[PDB]
Design an enzyme around this catalytic site. Structure first.
Site, PDB file in Angstrom:
ATOM      1  N   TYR A 105      -6.156  -1.748  -1.871  1.00 18.32           N
ATOM      2  CA  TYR A 105      -5.045  -0.509  -1.312  1.00 18.32           C
ATOM      3  C   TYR A 105      -3.801  -1.219  -1.250  1.00 18.32           C
ATOM      4  CZ  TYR A 105      -2.799   2.781   1.701  1.00 18.32           C
ATOM      5  OH  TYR A 105      -2.090   3.805   2.115  1.00 18.32           O
ATOM      6  N   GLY A 160      -2.291   6.492   0.996  1.00 14.93           N
ATOM      7  CA  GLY A 160      -3.087   7.518   1.362  1.00 14.93           C
ATOM      8  C   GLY A 160      -3.888   8.216   0.513  1.00 14.93           C
TER       9      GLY A 160
HETATM   10  O1  LIG Z   1      -5.279   6.642   4.368  1.00 16.42           O
HETATM   11  C1  LIG Z   1      -4.654   5.622   4.537  1.00 16.42           C
HETATM   12  O2  LIG Z   1      -4.979   4.495   4.939  1.00 16.42           O
HETATM   13  C2  LIG Z   1      -3.088   5.846   4.313  1.00 16.42           C
HETATM   14  C3  LIG Z   1      -2.353   7.012   4.888  1.00 16.42           C
HETATM   15  C4  LIG Z   1      -0.924   7.057   4.865  1.00 16.42           C
HETATM   16  C5  LIG Z   1      -0.556   8.372   5.397  1.00 16.42           C
HETATM   17  C6  LIG Z   1       0.936   8.526   5.215  1.00 16.42           C
HETATM   18  C7  LIG Z   1       1.942   7.572   4.711  1.00 16.42           C
HETATM   19  C8  LIG Z   1       1.443   6.170   4.028  1.00 16.42           C
HETATM   20  C9  LIG Z   1      -0.054   6.160   4.132  1.00 16.42           C
END
Ligand SMILES: O=C(O)/C=C/c1ccccc1
Ligand SMILES: O=C(O)/C=C/c1ccccc1
Ligand SMILES: O=C(O)/C=C/c1ccccc1
Lengths: 514, 513, 514
Positions: free
Chosen positions: A54, A61
């Protein structure tokens, strides 16, 4: 010879606040430096091997199902900081913003974030400088947004704050504080934009402030007893032993110490008196005080136990790795994906502390209400005025102000219960821990103002009851009043108290009466 | 029937066992000896005419009115009378008994002066199948409910049988084989004192929360088996990096629930090496939504709150919250203070109530995700069976769960509403009883939300893995089979209200084992 | 040629805001001037005849049982202003502080307060200047404290604020504003320190802001329908007629007007379609939209009806005399004593409006959540990004920020329910109206930020759906997007949006989409 905190693995709350407040400089211990160098090498390997990770090979997200080619990762991470910088509202105060930077640093120092030496150095430099990044307080559901703003600041693309709250533009900040622009070429941006750094930073400042306010709450309750002939038997250690809550035993012990040497409190145990037929009738006063004095150990104690829990939880959070993803030091797997960034712990403890603070502020408010009531203050002038009654109203206005501050505190409840599914349902549950910590902070500020009013009232009451020489007042009580009188004159005639109240409150939040 | 021997300390499980009637209660010899010694001390305090609240004084701000010995029995009889102004629904059977137990544990410490007979009446009540009928409202935190308890124990108030059916005082004493309470020793304040009601309510909350927490974990695990959840998010290594006890425990229990499952994804995504050809948009993301991925963190925070609540409650339950008190060492004849101030239970109950609302929110979102055809990865919309459209399955139940949650959120902490009362004598009050009661209501709502989730999951598991539950873990299979013994699959739409209610009642008293 | 509001007896909310915001000068009509001159004389007679009147021959609050001799009244009223000046917290903003001054003036203009010509002139001069008194926002239980600070400022003993909020000291204020120092020698201090002026001032500013935000909520709901092929039949007049709530009827009519001329909305009534055997099956989409579109008339309508109630009550409050004591213009009795200063009306309406604002903000937040979700936005890019997906996240951050703002709004409830007996039990019940009005204001500010995010999202969504030319978009929709694009560029690549969100929010609070 400014004190120095050497960060290895564990840092306690006092050390953390010392660094955040600029009272101590910080250094990364050799063992920690090595763990970080080792983690930096792991990130590099993960990247070279094109591992599915990731933020290194995926979008963010729900967009994480969009894989990204290695050639576009610096762009990917640059856009991350960009789209997350949507924060609004007043900027976090100097100490709190620095506490946030420290929290992110402590997490990285564990050696599982892959942060590069340069990145870690930039955080240490900020913490050793007299500056703080200017970051908006609102925007996160709990702390990517405020951290993204922090990144921009460290790159000279955002404002900085000096100790006074005066803003400096990015370039000026890097210049004045001798800071080098943050460089994320190593693709370690997720080491900075991650975790629960903001709520943790706000909570550590809350913890420090509550310790001081708690001390004042005790000192003022003790002085109140000296102004109203309070009975010390309710504060007996024997009573604490019968209901052994740590916070209560502690509060009672501290109260006893505050009035040690006082000739103004009633020290007789009523049950020692043997009654005969001639004693049967109505006496002037009851044998026990009203609750604002008699139940102080129990009320203050419950609050102290809540703070103790809050601090135990916060200590764990501050020294933990709340990053996602993480790179295991043992090398068992290239990386792990989870949700250690979910700040439910700080969210629940902040809400609990907020309630405790409101309860204790209510106690101080009622202590003020009793002390200023001519029908309840046992002979003191109404509203502790001096000069002719009627023509002078003394603290009559300030008394209502305290009530107004308390009433406002009560209008705001826990933040944690308002989770709303967001981020296209990916974040179907959120902690709102940052909000919870900020709401608790506001209540702490109101409590300091209420205590400030109580302190000014007590200084006046002590002199009205015992004369300017404070005859019979305990040594601790005398020292407290004398210290207040060094900056706050007696109320010989009515005068505006607003500015003095605000000034004293600022002091109460940073120093205890000793 | 097991027996709990009460000496000095009793844990929350033993307390609930007695309150729920699962175990008999016996006062250990050392406790009986300490109480007899305290009874003797009260006798001496009275003979010596020491100035003591409730023995030689009026009550509250009226304590400045001293009372002659010949009038003390009348004084204490009136105490019970004027305090009996409670209103509202009576406390449930278990909770009312828990209150009786709380008072007894306090007395057993040997500083209340309670006579052997008074203690025997409390023990008798707890060993019987009855509970005093006490109104839930009236105290600012617990003289009023305890006053009502005293009236019941004298046969001047109703009793409740296990079913909640009410019996008049006379019938209660006979059916339970109880002797009328006699306060001739002037030990009335040993019964009308302390934080017994809020403590009793809170200990019942503690027991219910432990069971619901086990269900929250078990259902989160089964959810993973129905939605191909990724277990790497529950890895112990992650727990070690953020060592909150509750989180580590939650993660471990989650892993145990899905052990042996072939329906979850166990691959660690970082193990995969990507090639240029893989770059693009894949069918699914490498991580699950928060309702699964952050379960350890959310459930864990809730578990740590419950652990704090229980630590504080254990101290309160085993403490003497009386006023006045008679020091066993004889240092002074009696001590006057405020150990009856229920601020500790008030604050922990409010904190737990918030945690409960947070966890109920998680369960509610898990239902919302499971029943959504755009999010449940191939499962029927609202887990219906039969023709779509003609059948809506759990569509109604899903909205009902949201309604229950929204209602929970409307009520906040009770502790912040202190109001100066009793002619300003009680200028600050804990409201602990109210706090514990509000927490109980949220706990009841959470049980109903979990019941809905459980019924949805049983259906989802069968829709995903067939009636045979192929690939489902042994624990998952056992849970679904257990449910299916009383709750049939939803092959065609039918009223679920009564089943939801029946299941919720079960979740509060038993865990999935 | 700066407009002028001539004050006689009644002034509507628009005129009041026009003066408070400096958009119009204020002048006292001949009949008002005469009513005030007459009242001034009545106060003189009351003093001359030594009538038992609060503040003229008595102390304050519970101290009113202390009668005061005429020669000490100047001192008495001077001390009044003094002991009441215990306010703390951030000062009210320029417009709100002036709105407070105006509120006191309108009350006085009814001719029952006894204010002297000079005193009235000082208030008028202030309103016709570019200045506002600098008054702390906290301290009152509902508004003597903030008004006492006002008096000090007007005497040159307190700070002033320019339109930008920059503070000036008393002297500089009187100088820059060409103001005369307030002289209370006529013993008319209670004409200034009285009533519900602060909460009323705060509420009238809330009223104005909610009208504009309400217009944006309608405009954005309409544009949302053009971006998602919304069905207009749910907004038909026939439906409004069946459930005749005024607010709903108006909301539905305004929504229909916004999409007039649009080719992007679905206008076909589904019931007109006759189904055959071959149609029975599963269609791509349902015949009705989700609630955030279909129930807009009902949700917005309930909010509008709440605002209407709030405005009816506020209009009465603004034009009423909330003073105590009062001097009956009909001369029936020398003076009357009561509690017209109890701000329960503003307290309850502010709390009700606060709830409505939170509900409407919730609607806007869900509209953002639906528009940015690729699974629900019917073909639009996830989070309305441009450029490569994943590499760019568009409004993904802003969307969560909107959720965070809403969650924070929900944490604060009604202020009115927190009455606490104070002032030695004299004020055993208090309204807390000022606090209620202030809490409502904070929610209005959050709502504006959420709407701003929605507006930015819709501008992007409209161009993504209909091209930069906005083909098929209604004339109203086109004008709104084009107006926004003049100051806010398209999001072709991720960029920080925080400052833009804040800038637009400020605009939404003062102007409607026209
Ligand atoms: O699913 C994740 O871990 C990340 C979520 C997210 C939500 C808003 C902005 C950036 C990352
Ligand atoms: O002051 C106390 O200890 C007693 C208070 C009280 C108040 C109401 C009813 C009974 C006792
Ligand atoms: O009784 C009143 O009308 C006055 C009350 C009051 C309270 C606090 C400060 C000034 C006046």
């Amino acid at each position: 010879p400014k004190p120095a905190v050497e960060l290895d693995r564990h840092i306690d709350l006092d050390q953390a606040h010392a660094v955040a407040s600029g009272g101590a400089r910080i250094v990364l211990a050799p063992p920690a430096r090595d763990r970080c160098r080792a983690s930096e090498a792991r990130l590099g390997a993960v990247i070279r091997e094109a591992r599915h990770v990731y933020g290194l090979t995926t979008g963010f997200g729900p967009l994480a199902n969009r894989l990204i080619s290695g050639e576009n990762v610096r762009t990917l991470q640059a856009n991350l900081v960009h789209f997350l910088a949507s924060g609004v509202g007043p900027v976090l105060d100097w100490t709190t913003a620095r506490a946030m930077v420290l929290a992110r640093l402590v997490s990285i120092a564990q050696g599982a974030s892959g942060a590069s030496e340069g990145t870690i150095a930039r955080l240490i430099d900020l913490l050793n400088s007299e500056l703080a990044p200017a970051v908006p307080s609102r925007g996160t559901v709990g702390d990517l947004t405020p951290l993204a703003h922090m990144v921009l600041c460290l790159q000279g693309r955002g404002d900085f704050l000096d100790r006074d709250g005066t803003r400096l533009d990015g370039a000026e900040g890097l210049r004045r504080g001798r800071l080098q622009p943050l460089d994320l070429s190593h693709r370690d941006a997720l080491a900075l934009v991650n975790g629960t750094s903001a709520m943790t930073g706000i909570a550590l400042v809350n913890a420090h402030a509550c310790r001081h306010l708690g001390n004042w709450a005790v000192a003022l309750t003790a002085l109140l007893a000296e102004c109203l002939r309070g009975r010390t038997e309710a504060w007996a250690a024997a009573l604490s032993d019968l209901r052994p809550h740590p916070g209560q035993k502690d509060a009672a012990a501290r109260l006893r110490a505050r009035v040690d040497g006082s000739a103004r409190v009633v020290r007789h145990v009523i049950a020692e008196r043997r009654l005969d037929a001639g004693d049967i009738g109505t006496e002037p006063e009851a044998g026990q005080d009203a609750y604002s004095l008699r139940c102080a150990p129990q009320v203050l104690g419950a609050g102290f136990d809540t703070l103790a829990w809050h601090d135990r939880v916060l200590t764990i959070e501050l020294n933990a790795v709340t990053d996602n993803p993480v790179f295991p030091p043992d090398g068992s797997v290239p990386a792990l994906h989870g949700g250690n960034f979910m700040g439910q712990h700080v969210a629940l403890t902040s809400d609990a502390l907020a309630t405790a603070v409101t309860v204790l502020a209510g106690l101080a408010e009622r202590q003020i209400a009793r002390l200023t009531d001519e029908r309840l203050n046992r002979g003191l002038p109404p509203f502790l005025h001096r000069g002719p009654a009627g023509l002078n109203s003394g603290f009559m206005g300030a008394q209502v102000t305290a009530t107004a501050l308390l009433a406002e505190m009560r209008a705001t409840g826990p933040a944690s219960i308002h989770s709303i599914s967001t981020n296209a349902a990916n974040q179907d549950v959120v902690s709102l821990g940052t909000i919870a910590a900020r709401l608790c902070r506001e209540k702490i500020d109101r409590w300091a103002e209420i205590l400030a009013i109580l302190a000014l009232c007590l200084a006046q009451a002590a002199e009205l009851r015992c004369g300017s020489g404070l005859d019979g007042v305990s040594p601790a009580g005398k020292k407290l009043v004398q210290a207040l009188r060094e900056q706050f004159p007696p109320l010989e005639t009515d005068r505006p108290l607003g500015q003095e109240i605000a000034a004293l409150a600022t002091h109460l939040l940073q120093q205890s009466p000793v």
